[PDB]
Amino acid sequence: AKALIVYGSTTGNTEYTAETIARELADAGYEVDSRDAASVEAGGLFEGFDLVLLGCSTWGDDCIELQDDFIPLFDSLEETGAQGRKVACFGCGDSSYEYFCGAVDAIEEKLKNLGAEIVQDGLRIDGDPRAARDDIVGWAHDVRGAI
Ligand SMILES: Cc1cc2nc3c(=O)[nH]c(=O)nc-3n(C[C@H](O)[C@H](O)[C@H](O)COP(=O)(O)O)c2cc1C
């Protein structure tokens, strides 16, 4: 099974999340290709992956903004080959803001509308992902099981 994890992370939290997930997946036998959103190109990006996991933290005060590096890919999601793709989303936020992890919701909804198959509800991490390591591993586990 080949997975692609693309993450947008400004202070490295969701990046830490992506790494924890990648390892969980790799320890399970998946081939895992992780990429920083800042570096990727959207066209055909999901092509050949059995599963795509998109990580993005949430910014904004009264307006949901996606982590800066992710925005270009977000805006080009229709160019990735997501139709029919098993995907799951994750991101770091903080529940004291108005839209907790609203970026996870935005990406998921876009995927859903592109016809991707959301295999698991989005992992929304409130606070430092390092304090939620267990939630991350159980989530990585549950997505492998939802495929
Ligand atoms: C000015 C500011 C605005 C933020 N806005 C939101 C928000 O609207 N919703 C949310 O859940 N988290 C919000 N966060 C929390 C960040 O998403 C959180 O710090 C996250 O750990 C950052 O992850 P990063 O390293 O991957 O990019 C905000 C943080 C800051 C400093």
**Per-residue three-class SS string for 48-117:** CCCEEEEEECEECCCCCEECCCCHHHHHCHHHCCCCCCEEEEEEEECCCCCCCCHHHHHHHHHHHHCCCE
Distance spanning both ends of the chain, measured CA to CA: 10
* Resolution, Å (one decimal): 1.8
Report the C-alpha gap between 126 and 111 in whole angstroms.
22
For residue 4, the SS3 value is strand
Report the C-alpha gap between 95 and 93 in whole angstroms.
7
Domain 1-147 CATH (choose: 3.30.1310.10, 3.40.50.2000, 3.40.50.360, 3.20.10.10): 3.40.50.360
Closest atom, ligand 1, to C-alpha of 56: 26
What are the structural domain ranges in the chain? 1-147
Supply the residue whose CA is at minimum distance from atom 4 of ligand 1: 59
Please identify which residue in the block is written with the tokens 């004291």.
96
The CA 58 to ligand 1 mean position distance, Å, reads 5
The token duo for 99 is 């839209």
The experimental method behind these coordinates is X-ray
* Nearest alpha carbon to residue 93 among 64, 132, 122, 125: 125
Determine contact, residues 107/66, Cβ cutoff 8 Å: yes
- Per the DSSP assignment, residues forming a β-bridge with 93 are 126
The CA 120 to ligand 1 mean position distance, Å, reads 22
Residues 6+ apart with CB under 8 A from 59: 10, 65, 66, 67, 68, 103
- Ligand 1 pocket by Cβ (under 6 Å): 9-14, 57-60, 67, 92-94, 97, 99-102
